[PDB]
Design a binder for these strands. Sequence first.
DNA 1: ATAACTTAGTATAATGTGCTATACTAAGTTAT
DNA 2: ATAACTTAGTATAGCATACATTATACTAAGTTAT
DNA 3: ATAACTTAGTATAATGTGCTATACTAAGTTAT
DNA 4: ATAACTTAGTATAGCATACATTATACTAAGTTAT
Lengths: 317, 323, 317, 323
Amino acid sequence: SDEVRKNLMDMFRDRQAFSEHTWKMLLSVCRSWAAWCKLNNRKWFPAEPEDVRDYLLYLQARGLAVKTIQQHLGQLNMLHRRSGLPRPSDSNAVSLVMRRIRKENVDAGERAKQALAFERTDFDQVRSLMENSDRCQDIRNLAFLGIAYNTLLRIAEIARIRVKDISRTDGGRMLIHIGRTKTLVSTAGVEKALSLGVTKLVERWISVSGVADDPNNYLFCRVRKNGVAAPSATSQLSTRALEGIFEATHRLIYGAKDDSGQRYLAWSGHSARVGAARDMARAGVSIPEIMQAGGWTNVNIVMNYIRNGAMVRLLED
Amino acid sequence: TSDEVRKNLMDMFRDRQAFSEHTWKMLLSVCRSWAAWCKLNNRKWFPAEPEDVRDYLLYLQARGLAVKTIQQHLGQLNMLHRRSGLPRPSDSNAVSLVMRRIRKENVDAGERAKQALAFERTDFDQVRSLMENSDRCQDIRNLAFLGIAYNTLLRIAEIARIRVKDISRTDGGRMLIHIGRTKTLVSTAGVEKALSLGVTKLVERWISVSGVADDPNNYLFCRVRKNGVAAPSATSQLSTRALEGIFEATHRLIYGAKDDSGQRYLAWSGHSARVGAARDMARAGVSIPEIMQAGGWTNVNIVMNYIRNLDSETGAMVRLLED
Amino acid sequence: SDEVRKNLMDMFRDRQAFSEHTWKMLLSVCRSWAAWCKLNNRKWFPAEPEDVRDYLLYLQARGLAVKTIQQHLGQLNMLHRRSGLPRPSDSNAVSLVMRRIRKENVDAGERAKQALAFERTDFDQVRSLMENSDRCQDIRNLAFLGIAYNTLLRIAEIARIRVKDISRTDGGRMLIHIGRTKTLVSTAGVEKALSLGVTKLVERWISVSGVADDPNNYLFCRVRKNGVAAPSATSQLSTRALEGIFEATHRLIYGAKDDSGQRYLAWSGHSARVGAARDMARAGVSIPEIMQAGGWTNVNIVMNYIRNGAMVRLLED
Amino acid sequence: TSDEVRKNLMDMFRDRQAFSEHTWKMLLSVCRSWAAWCKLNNRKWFPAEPEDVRDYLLYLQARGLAVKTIQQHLGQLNMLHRRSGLPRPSDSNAVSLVMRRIRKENVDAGERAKQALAFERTDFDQVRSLMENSDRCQDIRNLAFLGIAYNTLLRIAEIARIRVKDISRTDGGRMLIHIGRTKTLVSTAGVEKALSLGVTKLVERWISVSGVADDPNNYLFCRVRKNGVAAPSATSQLSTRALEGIFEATHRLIYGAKDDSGQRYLAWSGHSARVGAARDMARAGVSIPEIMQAGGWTNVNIVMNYIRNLDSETGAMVRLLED
DNA sequence: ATAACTTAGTATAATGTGCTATACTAAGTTAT
DNA sequence: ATAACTTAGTATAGCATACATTATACTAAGTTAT
DNA sequence: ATAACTTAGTATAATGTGCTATACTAAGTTAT
DNA sequence: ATAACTTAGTATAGCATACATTATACTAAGTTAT
């Protein structure tokens, strides 16, 4: 117990060893779990395997996604493991129930959704329309969409970029230095090459916004109603805003979205990653070159982002 | 504690849906076997002792069983103990040692793994030619089945689950069958298979002589009784035995007697057709984007095993030597 | 001790879990070690780290190769580890001395040798000469050399082949089914494709030797002075003989070997593996295709087997 | 036990040749540092306590030190304890946690890793043009040094070790320098570098004005005193400082003042020339068989970092966008 | 008054051998 | 009687979910320079 | 008598982060 | 006195040896069908 109160103290003292989203979700789950315990007269910690099992079945009955239920189990599992206690998943009740929840939800259909693709055709149509705008917002939004599709960087990676991270190929092409990603942390990092067209788009944004004033300013910043940019070296444009661009841009071409309320009806922060990976495959790009582009290190995310007659052909004659 | 183990067996039963029916079928099968040898040999079957599982594994080896089967037995026993709270036998030296020896002792004697009497175009063309004219409601149906099997490359448990409306003309005065073939999360939902003015039209006949989706619960294929009469079924699945048998009865119509010795794969099986489309998809010049996609194969290890003996797969050396 | 006498008994009872060469070398090292202990009044088991250190330095002083000294340490290490005792290498005296022996021997030059290459040019010259022989030995030896270079199989893999392992590509090419290798054990295994020329060579050997009499006969067998083959389904041609072929064949074209006595003066069992890997690289064959050919799973053995001005070029103008 | 640890420090010293002089130099350096902070902070430096190494690592981070340097300190301390029999600090939670945070906290502030002010053809052509005419025994020598550096792509510690007879004409009225560049087992022994009627001939001048292998113990390069006089040395090595300085003094002759701020790589360094041949070997159209071979690079990770900002390395996307 | 955010919380995706399916033997089940 | 299946049990061949995070997606409400 | 092995033993190769090098600052060493 | 090095100490960037086998290489001596 004392050795457990110290272990949890050592974790919270060196919080920053983990992503801010990890704490955010760890706290969210503990909240949810603790609330469930209270309502049922149960001790939230250490967690009892039978209680954890009931909570998972409870989340399932709530109609939550399998990945969501796995997130809860995972947060509780880390809380315990890092406390020095056994994980709920080290018990059969929990292990087996997780599988069963997976098996049942899937055998009933449920499938992990992936963002609506934002491909070359989409980028060209969008560019064809926005290119002519002198609005600062439009200029910004077009430069963002170009980098997104070109680089495949995640919205969080994009919002991080600083004016000082941009270099130049002799050929005139823009080069973006990326430090940390979701699958990488290092003083090394990657250099992102921008096409001449995309470089143009970005250069135009730099000029109108006046971000290059100070190289420590984030490349992307807000643009108020009066069309005046608002550069900053301490605050980034929220990823929530980076998402709005995608949603706004889709509303521009396709109008307002379904009343269903279901996820993925318009483009989102990940649309360009998915779309470019797909475009790359369709062009015969080497899976290995595709991975370099996406920065992945494996072959399944890549592999997955696609799929779709050939076999007809032969018999067809 | 027997309470700790007993609570573990209760966890297992309570959440048995955590595993497949097949997995349970195999787990019981192995236990029935393990339990049967222990008694005969006067051993306690649970918990399983290392010198016992070892002795048992030597029994299976001397039973002339495959290494992948001996692995299956050890697996179920390991699975049984892992979910019981008892130590897994493979976590034992004696057991760990014996498996390493059996593995090697076996390949060193000629343990060959069976693939599949491929069912290629030569085969479809020949069967088609033999039954195309028959008015037999059965030949008509089995021609469509073999028809899709090739063109479509789907599984056996997946051509059964198929229903009727999953077929449109949209393709354009031609057929497209709509499907479902996954079971993951990130995985998938469905696909859109098409057919020549063979696989699609051959089916038509089935459609004409079987009933059709009078009630689309109606699975595509159904039984055809001795009276050459179908039993369109909106709710029942054609067994995988029946479906596999079409591949077997068909090879018997042709070569007959099914072939002797006592061995595996003497005729065509459920997978025969997929192997045939692959080896064929290999000779025509087919990219892996294409080969993998067609058979819904997540990997390349399996496909290649299928086209292994293909002049098109000879290797760099043969290429260098033949400059 | 009792738990140690049982562990060693369990190892010797399931000996066959290990290669015959592993026992052979385990016994050879124990022999060497025990002899050294006796001569010095030391207990050979369990081994004392300081004694092991002295033995290693003793082997080094004997002028043995670094890999040889590592073999001794490795056998002793397995003997202990598998007995349930701590490995000599788990002690600093032994760990550090091994490194130091490595460092010192190398810093003085010593380099791991690799077999003399038997390449396409060598195969063509040899074939050009032997092709015309009606001798059974020559016919056998030429077929062996062709398979060796074509398949890259190790001599042990070659001596294992059985008549029943040979198939046929529709195109007429010979196919050899390989089960176990040094890096593989499985009911699966590989199929080795023979070129039309090589297939021809093999077919000619099959015809004259009369090996195909019984498909369980090893493809390769002895051929006595009177030129009469001697097929068998229980005995293989010794790898020592497979080596003699390479040595004989080299003596045929280059004559008798240096009086130095040094290893690798003529071709050996591994010459064709090295030579074909090299030939494949020189032809621009994909490292990945090269690995498939050699059956490797890594990229260093492959990588190593080669190396050898380009960089001059540019400046050169 | 202090006897167990003391026996461990004796094992360490007795077989100190198990490590490089550099490794020991770094191990002492870290200890001198760790020992100095502990005292100042009233901590016991050995054995090292987790909350202490953690505090220490926060000191280095706030010292504005690189993450690869903070890693070096933890490494030596781990190495010291591992070979002492005491538990390694990184095997501690507090220590393990702090490193994970520092790593991330640092990249999140702009921890950039330095590469090398490349020394390409533009550079050789310019230096050559500036010194080609000089009669200075020093310019003559440093032109040959920079000459090979580029053409040859060898290390700094490897152009020094070179001696005289490792140079023939065989190439054909041209030069070839014979070398040695490994230190493994399976690795290698030597190589055979050549040069244009520049790198080889530029050297000639050095050969003419320095002495030559009057005694082939004679390393190729040697000091040239203030009197512009050489000191051909069969036994002494030109220090790596001197060799590196030629790259530095040369950049100063050109841009002078060496460049201010306080930072790393403001001029050319020992590796400058290799990076230049690579980026250059990249623009001419060079295969990796060729690029790796030239710099004796066992891997591709390092080389690519060198040509990263090359239009030739832009990527598939830029290629697709520019169709 | 607002555009155009930002903040904040819950929901869900994405990434750096052991389980499940088929093969084959046989015996059971229905309806012709 | 059997054809034509189904069910069952075991051999054997092919597949992919569980770890430990770290990030995106979406809803909702708060904020500030016009 | 032998060719052409095989057997047998020792020697050595081959395969399915932590150590070592450079960079840079400075202070020391010799000979002009 | 300084130019031209060397040595030293620490920061930082790039490399590859240690595990656990399993096999080949070489020397030597024994074996058997001619």
